[PDB]
Amino acid sequence: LEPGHAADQEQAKLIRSAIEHTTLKSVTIASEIYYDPDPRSTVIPEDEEIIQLHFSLLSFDQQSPWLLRLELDRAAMNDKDLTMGQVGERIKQTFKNDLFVIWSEDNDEKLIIRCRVVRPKSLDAETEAEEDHMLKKIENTMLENITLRGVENIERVVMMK
Amino acid sequence: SLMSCISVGTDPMPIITFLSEWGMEPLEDYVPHQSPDATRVFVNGVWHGVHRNPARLMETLRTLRRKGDINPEVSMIRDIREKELKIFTDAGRVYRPLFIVEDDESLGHKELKVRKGHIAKLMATEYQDIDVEEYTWSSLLNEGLVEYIDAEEEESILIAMQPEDLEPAEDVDPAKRIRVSHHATTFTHCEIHPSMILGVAASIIPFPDHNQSPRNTYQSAMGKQAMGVFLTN
Amino acid sequence: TTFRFCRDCNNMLYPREDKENNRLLFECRTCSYVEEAGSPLVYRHELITNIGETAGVVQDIGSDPTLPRSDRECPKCHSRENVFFQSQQRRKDTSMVLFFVCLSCSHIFTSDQKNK
Amino acid sequence: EVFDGNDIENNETKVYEESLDLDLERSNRQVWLVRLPMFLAEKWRDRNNLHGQELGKIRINKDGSKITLLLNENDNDSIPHEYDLELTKKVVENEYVFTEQNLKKYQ
Amino acid sequence: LPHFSKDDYSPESKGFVENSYLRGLTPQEFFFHAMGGREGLIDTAVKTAETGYIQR
Amino acid sequence: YIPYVKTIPKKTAIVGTVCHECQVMPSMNDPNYHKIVEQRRNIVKLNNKE
Amino acid sequence: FDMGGYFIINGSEKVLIAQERSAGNIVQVFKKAAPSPISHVAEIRSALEKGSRFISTLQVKLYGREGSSARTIKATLPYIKQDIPIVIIFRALGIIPDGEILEHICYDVNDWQMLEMLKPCVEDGFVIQDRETALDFIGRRGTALGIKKEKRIQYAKDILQKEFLPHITQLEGFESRKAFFLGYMINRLLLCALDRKDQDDRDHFGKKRLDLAGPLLAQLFKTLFKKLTKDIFRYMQRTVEEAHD
Amino acid sequence: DPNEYNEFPLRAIPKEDLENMRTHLLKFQSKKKINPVTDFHLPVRLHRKDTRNLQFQLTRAEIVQRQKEISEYKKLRRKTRQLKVLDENAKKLRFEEFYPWVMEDFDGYNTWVGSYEAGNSDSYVLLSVEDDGSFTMIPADKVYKFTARNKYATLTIDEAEKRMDKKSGEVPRWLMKHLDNIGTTTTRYDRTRRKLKAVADQ
Ligand SMILES: [Zn+2]
Ligand SMILES: [Zn+2]
Structure with missing residues (x-):
């Protein structure tokens, strides 16, 4: 560490978190593909409040009816100090503006991320068959090749005195 | 090892016929969805069918093997958790004998089937040669007091090291070794004697348990280079 | 699914x-x-899954002589005989929690005290 | 017994003097598929036997749930005279019995 | 070994030789100690060969 | 289509439909029982080979 | 005091040292290192102790790694030169319904995890939907080049009958047993892939066999007797052709 | 014992009618109840024929119509070789089962192909219930497992293998329905019914 903060442990943890490579796969439990008739109401009891909040306070007409849900582990996000805002922005910037994502706050009893692929103006009939397949493909890619923060080829870091 | 043996193999067709006649449903009409509790029966690595009461099937098979209807070299393993019943008859399997432990509710606790009367007859036959009815290791095997066990079958049995303290239900000399009882009441077999795990060369070392193992290996190697009397001719 | x-x-x-x-x-x-x-x-x-923890339980699990016996109390029938084993998943990330099977009612419970 | 296939020439009329269509007339006939032990099958499947003699009788309880076979005294007191018919499948579907015979090749 | 119960993590089950050479080793301790000695012998042979090559 | 298929006509007839599947098992309470037990034990005890 | 157990050849006492080999007719599942397209492989060295003394190896490989979007199962059959999808093999064995194939593989109606991992196999084998097409698909892959267009189905059938899992049987009319055994192998492979069981230990003495003087001389005599019979037939042909006594 | 039970005579089958005839078992492999008396379109033929290309073979109704329209329109070796010993029973079984049983209805709605089962071919014994309360015993000969063929317009080997090549060219999800709309890749049943209806309409 820097000679002016070598003895500090909080800055040690900060730099360790800034260099350690962590992926969404390490902070998620499961991924689900759901069907929702419209991007305004939900069938899952839990996300009813999240959708209402985000939609109420602030396009959505052309969102696809297929939803991608990620269930994230608070015990996994507390081992390394992470907040939903950083990961949400990371996902939003991996694909700049070609899909809409909402994320629950840390205060929620359960941690969930909801994503929806946005279709273009043109309507494709052949892509409907592989729509769910495309969802699984993007799920695999966003699970594997996403660098939330850290340096490449860094498996794990351990602090020692 | 001293008491190790290698099976010579026998015909599996009689065992297949026996299993078929004792309720082994053919594999041609096995529907898993309507019977998610059947145990798969394997013979020499061939899935021949399924059975509904593996407990009774195994009990009958073990009784037959003990009394000598099936060749003792045949190995039988019941993987309860995996719901499998494997029977091996092919040659080349290494096995060794072990004592048989039964409930014997007369004393209220499990004990070896072999008794002091059996030992007396064995010793009488041993010393009469130097005329009571012959009583040999084959006699023990046919009376079901010992049983051949291979490595695969050893996976599904519990063996008591000695009958002196592990079999009885349950001051100490400071010089004696510290032995762990393991407090287990489900023993199915008992070692004849642990000293039989050693080989020919290693059975000459005196007190090998007080030596470092590399020294035992060195002695095993060297004892084959000691001068003696290889033959009398 | x-x-x-x-x-x-x-x-x-x-x-x-x-x-x-x-x-x-x-x-x-x-x-x-x-x-x-x-x-x-x-x-x-299911990236982190608990399926297979109690796999292998059968109506004759107690007939296995290799399973260890315990004196723990079954909190549905008040019995003291039971056979316990560790998790059956071989992933090198699971805890050492024990699962107990009662020989009187065929009920399965766990020794976990953190999450249960 | 080789013969043409589609037979668009209508050769069956003279080659065969019998209908080639499956005879669906006795299909409405209850049939029991019974699996026998080896000892009983080795004497019930013999071709030098089965001259029409009485092999025994079947006894079924009036209320059902239990069916037994009572063989005659022709077994030579070497096998049991009483057996239980265990119904492995009370309701059976998609199982039929069909015969196979040759056809007349002339006219 | 086929002498303990499944899922046993005690020192005597996972190879802790409580006794000394003067007292003598119980059979299970003897087998585990033999396993360790065999590891040592194999390491000796392989390392001899590899070190010879490296020195050359 | 194909003009030739090379069929083999035969005289066949349906003469029944199976309704019950039965398994014959000797009665445990029969006086002649346990003779089959000895026969079945012999099935494995006897060795054909010389 | 002499115990025997040796042979005297040219006046020198010779003893046959027992040879240790891996037991056959047992399914063994192994994991492969990262630098490869196969993650798990279930192998069986099918062996028959009586009748031909030849060994045929059957392997079922799970292509793709844990980071792949589609992991399929492919089986290598003798004299095929390529790995055929398990679904196509099942259809060639006579089970066209995908429900029946999944019944043969997975024996639980709630093991949705294994069924999810099995989805790619049926997706890959979707095109083939009948036994004749599956049989010809397998047959054309064989390295015979004598079957033109109509013996392909029969060649594939004969291969699947006599060279596929020979330890079960080699006679016609036992496709159900072959299908069930293949499903068993795939089930074990899928369990290992789902990490519910560890890879089979290769050092387990229960999976090993010791060949004594008996089996060794048996196979040597088998080879020598085959050579002798070949020589007898050659002499018969020579006398019949060249008109000799 | 009391007469609460019911007993029926069991009689052997006369051997005078058991010669030159073989009784087999037919097992339809489907999840829906199948009855060839009511479900099938009579007449129904059960013969032995080659199963190769069992998608473009003339139906019985089509052959009858073809006959009607035809009537209207007309109105050295090596001299030394080694033969390998083969068991006569197996050779006979192969010869007899070379052409599997095929059961086809009149309209082609049902076309089943049978396969020989050797697991329990002979162990079974049949008990026919005579129309007098008595039972007659007949030995079993063989067991055949019948599977449906060409019920949902299966593709051909050429098309299937051409569709399997090339990672990037993945198989479309609803290709069967999309092609069925095109009209190609139909079944024998539909192909015969549409043509027969096109003739009947006139
Ligand atoms: Zn309880
Ligand atoms: Zn469908």
């Missing part, structure tokens, strides 16, 4: 969307048979 098989040819059904009703159907890819969906869930990936 509840995979569904076809009623006429026993083939595998696949999800489809009907825009006329904006609903979810399951249709067979070869015989043209359809059925309205019952739940909106069609895919699940």
Whole structure:
């Protein structure tokens, strides 16, 4: 560490978190593909409040009816100090503006991320068959090749005195 | 090892016929969805069918093997958790004998089937040669007091090291070794004697348990280079 | 996830969307048979899973002489005899929690005191 | 017994003097598929036997749930005279019995 | 070994030789100690060969 | 289509439909029982080979 | 005091040292290292102790790694030159319904995890939907080049009958047993892939066999007797052709 | 014992009618109840024929119509070789089962192909219930498992293998329905019914 903060442990943890490579796969439990008739109401009891909040306070007409849900582990996000805002922005910037994502706050009893692929103006009939397949493909890619923060080829870091 | 043996193999067709006649449903009409509790029966690595009461099937098979209807070299393993019943008859399997432990509710606790009367007859036959009815290791095997066990079958049995303290239900000399009882009441077999795990060369070392193992290996190697009397001719 | 098989040819059904009703159907890819969906869930990936923890439990588990016996109390019948074992998943990330099976009611409980 | 296939020439009329269509007339006949032990099958499947003699009788309880076979005294007191018929499948589907015979090749 | 119960993590089950050479080793301790000695012998041979090559 | 298929006609007839599947098992309470037990034990005890 | 157990050849006492080999007719599942397209492989060295003394190896490989979007199962059959999808093999064995194939593989109606991992196999084998097409698909892959267009189905059938899992049987009319055994192998492979069981230990003495003087001389005598019979037939042909006594 | 039970005579089958005839078992492999008396379109033929290309073979109704329209329109070796010993029973079984049983209805709605089962071919014994309360015993000969063929317009080997090549060219999800709309890749049943209806309409 820097000679002016070598003895500090909080800055040690900060730099360790800034260099350690962590992926969404390490902070998620499961991924689900759901069907929702419209991007305004939900069938899952839990996300009813999240959708209402985000939609109420602030396009959505052309969102696809297929939803991608990620269930994230608070015990996994507390081992390394992470907040939903950083990961949400990371996902939003991996694909700049070609899909809409909402994320629950840390205060929620359960941690969930909801994503929806946005279709273009043109309507494709052949892509409907592989729509769910495309969802699984993007799920695999966003699970594997996403660098939330850290340096490449860094498996794990351990602090020692 | 001293008491190790290698099976010579026998015909599996009689065992297949026996299993078929004792309720082994053919594999041609096995529907898993309507019977998610059947145990798969394997013979020499061939899935021949399924059975509904593996407990009774195994009990009958073990009784037959003990009394000598099936060749003792045949190995039988019941993987309860995996719901499998494997029977091996092919040659080349290494096995060794072990004592048989039964409930014997007369004393209220499990004990070896072999008794002091059996030992007396064995010793009488041993010393009469130097005329009571012959009583040999084959006699023990046919009376079901010992049983051949291979490595695969050893996976599904519990063996008591000695009958002196592990079999009885349950001051100490400071010089004696510290032995762990393991407090287990489900023993199915008992070692004849642990000293039989050693080989020919290693059975000459005196007190090998007080030596470092590399020294035992060195002695095993060297004892084959000691001068003696290889033959009398 | 509840995979569904076809009623006429026993083939595998696949999800489809009907825009006329904006609903979810399951249709067979070869015989043209359809059925309205019952739940909106069609895919699940379980990265951290607890399936297989108690795999291998049978009506005759207690007949195994290798399983260790315990004196723990079964909190549904008040019995003291039971056989316990560790998790059956071989992943090198699981805890050493013990699962106990009662020999009187065939009930399975756990020794966990953190989450239960 | 080789013969043409599609037979668009209508050769069956003279080659065969019998109908080639499956005879679906006795299909409405209850049939029991019974699996026998080896000892009983080795004497019930013999071709030098089965001259029409009485092999025994079947006894079924009036209320059902239990069916037994009572063989005659022709077994030579070497096998049991009483057996239980265990119904492995009370309701059986898609199982039929069909025969196979040759056809007349002339006219 | 086929002498303990499944899922046993005690020192005597996973190879802790409580006794000394003067007292003598119980059979299970003897087998585990033999396993360790065999590891040592194999390491000796392989390392001899590899070190010879490296020195050359 | 194909003009030739090379069929083999035969006289066949359906003469019954199976309704019950039965398994014959000797009665445990029969006086002649346990003779089959000895026979079945012999099935494995006897060795054909010389 | 002499115990025997040796042979005297040219006046020198010779003893046959027992040879240790891996037991056959047992399914063994192994994991492969990262630098490869196969993650798990279930192998069986099918062996028959009586009748031909030849060994045929059957392997079922799970292509793709844990980071792949589609992991399929492919089986290598003798004299095929390529790995055929398990679904196609099942259809060639006579089980066209995908429901029946999944019944043969997975024996639980709630093991949705294994069924999910099995989805890619049926997706890959979707095109083939009948026994004749599956049989010809397998047959054309064989390295015979004598079957033109109509013996392909029969060649594939004969291969699947006599060279596929020979330890079960080699006679016609036992496709159900072959299908069930293949499903068992795939089930074990899928369990290992789902990490519910560890890879089979290769050092387990229960999976090993010791060949004594008996089996060794048996196979040597088998080879020598085959050579002798070949020589007898050659002499018969020579006398019949060249008109000799 | 009391007469609460019911007993029926069991009689052997006369051997005078058991010669030159073999009784087999037919097992339809489907999840829906199948009855060839009511479900099938009579007449129904059960013969032995080659199963190769069992998608473009003339139906019985089509052959009858063809006959009607035809009537209207007309109105050295090596001299030394080694033969390998083969068991006569197996050779006979192969010869007899070379052409599997095929059961086809009149309209082609049902076309089943049978396969020989050797697991329990002979162990079974049949008990026919005579129309007098008595039972007659007949030995079993063989067991055949019948599977449906060409019920949902299966593709051909050429098309299937051409569709399997090339990672990037993945198989479309609803290709069967899309092609069925085109009209190609149909079944024998539909192909015969549409043509027969096109003739009947006139
Ligand atoms: Zn369908
Ligand atoms: Zn309880």
